[PDB]
Amino acid sequence: MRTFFVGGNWKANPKTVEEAEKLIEMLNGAKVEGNVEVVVAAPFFFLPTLQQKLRKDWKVSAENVFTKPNGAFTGEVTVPMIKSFGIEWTILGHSERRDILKEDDEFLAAKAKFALENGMKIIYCCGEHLSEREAGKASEFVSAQIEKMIPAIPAGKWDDVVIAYEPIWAIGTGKVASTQDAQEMCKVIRDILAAKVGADIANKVRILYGGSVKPNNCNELAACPDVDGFLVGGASLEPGFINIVNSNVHSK
Amino acid sequence: MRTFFVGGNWKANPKTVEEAEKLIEMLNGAKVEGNVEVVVAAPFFFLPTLQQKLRKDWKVSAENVFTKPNGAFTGEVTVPMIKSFGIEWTILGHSERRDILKEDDEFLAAKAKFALENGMKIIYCCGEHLSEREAGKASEFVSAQIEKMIPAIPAGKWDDVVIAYEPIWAIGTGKVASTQDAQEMCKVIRDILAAKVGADIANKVRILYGGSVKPNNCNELAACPDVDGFLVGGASLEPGFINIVNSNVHSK
Ligand code: NA
Ligand code: NA
Ligand code: NA
Ligand code: NA
Ligand code: NA
Ligand code: NA
């Protein structure tokens, strides 16, 4: 069985270091049940304190990184900077960056290749928008994205990739995703991997559900056979995060 | 006389926290001559250590910030986060972000308004590209940018604005800027301010030269009457930074 994986994405939160420290102390006291690999992603500015203070059985992640080691890229944070502090993970391709910050697939593949070649592990995000969901073309859209991702992955690095499916069509659209939606698209992704890079890899890669995950739906989502975990949004800031981490006991 | 102002922009450098700490220890030992306001901008990830360890007579600056207090903006760092740690400054509108990260004037004006309304001080960057320089339309282009900036500034906040002119036309183009180029464009900007917001404000706002500044040209640049200081690139990482900070003795 693949090890269940839960990434907590704080996004651009909290507002103060005092709040981030309080949240860390809450995470540190949580009793994890079952078996699960937990990663916490936070704003660059809080990454030093998170790495220093977060429980050592969990790992810290950046929410984005640039494509280069360093250079004339005012405002950007790079792989060597966060790796120099012991941070092993980054999220790439999150819907908010693809959209608001206009990150395209070419930019994202470069990031994934550079990050992996430089020893990082990645949570690579994908997912289709409302028009493609409505048109019933969700699998084609998601395939194209995964197909741009695939050649970024060096030989031997699939152990360092996790994929998160975001139902962007259910974010701020008036539509909601069902548990079966989540299962279906995670299976779509697994099958794309099997067809393109082989069953051995497909059978080991964790594919996460990245839509709305809360204490009230995490257990039924975890039980879906192709859902290997979550990239959690707003609940990653709340005590409910632990219920989600613990939903691993319902996945087999 | 306006107080001479030197901002050191590390850009996306150095690669490691060990290097940033060594650079800080170098800055801390430097003997400043004359009178000058010094700000050091560094990657988000190094801002905590810079704020903790940098000499207290100088101030730390972010190299960019987002337009919102917090929220669903994966990868972004916000004003309250850096203000919560005592950081008072940010750079906005740097050419590398306008270009590589595709930041437009509307995005940048929003940042400046939000930053200022939230108690930040800003270094707002502007500057024209090669085609406008060649066409002799450098002043019109720069005016338009400043004209988008101006309504972002709340009543009473001009004391918290510094403007940096970047001769983008001389970055990676095969063309170099002269000392007279720097003076001319800093004067162009001052005159736009005087005409649009009044002489009192124009006479107090520091306008910096943001092109290539090194130990070998800083004294002649500082002596230009409308050049009030520098936003320094690569030399901000080198012992030469101090020669630049000290070029204030040549400006009157
Ligand atoms: Na279809
Ligand atoms: Na490997
Ligand atoms: Na499952
Ligand atoms: Na002209
Ligand atoms: Na004021
Ligand atoms: Na001067």
Tab-separated table of C-alpha atoms in Angstrom, chain A residues 103-225:
chain	number	residue	atom	x	y	z
A	103	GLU	CA	2.200	30.570	-13.968
A	104	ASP	CA	2.112	28.488	-17.183
A	105	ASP	CA	2.940	24.825	-17.770
A	106	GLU	CA	6.374	25.609	-19.243
A	107	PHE	CA	7.299	27.657	-16.153
A	108	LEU	CA	6.036	24.840	-13.897
A	109	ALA	CA	7.819	22.002	-15.698
A	110	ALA	CA	11.067	24.010	-15.417
A	111	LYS	CA	10.455	24.361	-11.676
A	112	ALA	CA	9.771	20.647	-11.256
A	113	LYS	CA	12.877	19.645	-13.203
A	114	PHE	CA	15.114	22.071	-11.392
A	115	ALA	CA	13.631	21.221	-7.982
A	116	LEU	CA	13.980	17.459	-8.496
A	117	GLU	CA	17.467	17.633	-10.022
A	118	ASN	CA	18.374	19.633	-6.927
A	119	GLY	CA	17.184	17.085	-4.407
A	120	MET	CA	13.766	18.489	-3.612
A	121	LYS	CA	10.534	16.555	-3.262
A	122	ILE	CA	7.465	18.109	-4.919
A	123	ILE	CA	3.726	18.290	-4.617
A	124	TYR	CA	2.702	19.002	-8.211
A	125	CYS	CA	-0.818	20.355	-8.628
A	126	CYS	CA	-3.152	19.951	-11.580
A	127	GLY	CA	-6.860	20.228	-12.258
A	128	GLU	CA	-9.438	21.465	-14.726
A	129	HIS	CA	-11.659	24.575	-14.778
A	130	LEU	CA	-15.429	24.881	-15.036
A	131	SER	CA	-15.779	24.917	-18.828
A	132	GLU	CA	-13.826	21.665	-19.246
A	133	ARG	CA	-15.759	19.969	-16.402
A	134	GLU	CA	-19.079	20.989	-17.966
A	135	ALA	CA	-17.939	19.925	-21.413
A	136	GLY	CA	-17.011	16.555	-19.975
A	137	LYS	CA	-13.372	17.032	-21.006
A	138	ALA	CA	-11.892	16.921	-17.537
A	139	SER	CA	-9.709	13.874	-18.264
A	140	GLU	CA	-8.244	15.365	-21.463
A	141	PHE	CA	-7.364	18.605	-19.744
A	142	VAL	CA	-5.786	16.853	-16.787
A	143	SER	CA	-3.880	14.488	-19.076
A	144	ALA	CA	-2.295	17.406	-20.982
A	145	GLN	CA	-1.022	18.936	-17.730
A	146	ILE	CA	0.366	15.627	-16.511
A	147	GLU	CA	1.889	15.100	-19.915
A	148	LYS	CA	3.758	18.405	-19.598
A	149	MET	CA	4.895	17.338	-16.117
A	150	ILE	CA	6.141	13.885	-17.010
A	151	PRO	CA	9.295	14.796	-18.967
A	152	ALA	CA	10.357	17.121	-16.104
A	153	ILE	CA	10.869	14.082	-13.848
A	154	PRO	CA	14.446	12.744	-14.073
A	155	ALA	CA	15.092	9.000	-14.060
A	156	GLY	CA	14.756	7.711	-10.482
A	157	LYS	CA	12.865	10.693	-9.085
A	158	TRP	CA	9.272	9.435	-9.081
A	159	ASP	CA	9.764	8.473	-5.446
A	160	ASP	CA	10.052	12.218	-4.867
A	161	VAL	CA	6.846	13.244	-6.605
A	162	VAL	CA	3.335	13.560	-5.187
A	163	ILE	CA	0.482	14.816	-7.408
A	164	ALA	CA	-2.484	16.861	-6.127
A	165	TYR	CA	-5.727	17.114	-8.087
A	166	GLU	CA	-7.575	20.419	-7.556
A	167	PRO	CA	-11.169	20.602	-8.782
A	168	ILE	CA	-10.767	24.228	-9.858
A	169	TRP	CA	-14.251	23.954	-11.327
A	170	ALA	CA	-15.561	23.834	-7.746
A	171	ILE	CA	-13.620	26.846	-6.448
A	172	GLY	CA	-15.657	29.997	-6.437
A	173	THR	CA	-17.942	28.722	-9.195
A	174	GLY	CA	-21.211	27.811	-7.497
A	175	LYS	CA	-20.543	24.103	-8.077
A	176	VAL	CA	-19.463	21.549	-5.480
A	177	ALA	CA	-17.419	18.365	-5.887
A	178	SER	CA	-18.682	14.952	-4.723
A	179	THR	CA	-16.629	12.195	-3.154
A	180	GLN	CA	-17.044	10.196	-6.359
A	181	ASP	CA	-15.660	13.174	-8.376
A	182	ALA	CA	-12.504	12.964	-6.260
A	183	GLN	CA	-12.116	9.200	-6.734
A	184	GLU	CA	-12.794	9.437	-10.466
A	185	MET	CA	-10.152	12.098	-11.156
A	186	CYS	CA	-7.525	10.517	-8.926
A	187	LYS	CA	-8.096	7.291	-10.894
A	188	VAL	CA	-7.893	9.234	-14.175
A	189	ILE	CA	-4.461	10.503	-13.132
A	190	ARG	CA	-3.213	7.107	-11.989
A	191	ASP	CA	-4.249	5.616	-15.343
A	192	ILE	CA	-2.476	8.379	-17.265
A	193	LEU	CA	0.686	7.559	-15.299
A	194	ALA	CA	0.339	3.819	-15.923
A	195	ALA	CA	-0.171	4.326	-19.637
A	196	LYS	CA	2.694	6.849	-20.002
A	197	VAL	CA	5.372	5.844	-17.448
A	198	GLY	CA	4.336	2.322	-16.403
A	199	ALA	CA	2.338	0.496	-13.734
A	200	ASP	CA	5.212	0.237	-11.205
A	201	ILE	CA	5.453	3.990	-10.991
A	202	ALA	CA	1.674	4.503	-11.094
A	203	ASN	CA	1.249	2.074	-8.239
A	204	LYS	CA	3.668	3.947	-6.007
A	205	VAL	CA	2.875	7.603	-6.731
A	206	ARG	CA	0.584	9.217	-4.184
A	207	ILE	CA	-2.202	11.198	-5.798
A	208	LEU	CA	-3.939	13.590	-3.431
A	209	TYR	CA	-7.354	15.230	-3.434
A	210	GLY	CA	-6.831	18.992	-3.377
A	211	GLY	CA	-10.395	20.257	-3.293
A	212	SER	CA	-12.309	21.261	-0.136
A	213	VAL	CA	-11.312	18.854	2.638
A	214	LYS	CA	-12.703	19.254	6.177
A	215	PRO	CA	-13.374	17.065	9.214
A	216	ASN	CA	-16.871	16.326	7.857
A	217	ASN	CA	-15.747	14.787	4.539
A	218	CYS	CA	-12.196	13.560	5.074
A	219	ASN	CA	-13.036	10.001	6.158
A	220	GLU	CA	-15.225	9.240	3.141
A	221	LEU	CA	-12.665	10.857	0.803
A	222	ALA	CA	-9.771	8.858	2.332
A	223	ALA	CA	-11.684	5.592	1.817
A	224	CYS	CA	-11.793	6.089	-1.979
A	225	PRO	CA	-9.275	3.580	-3.426
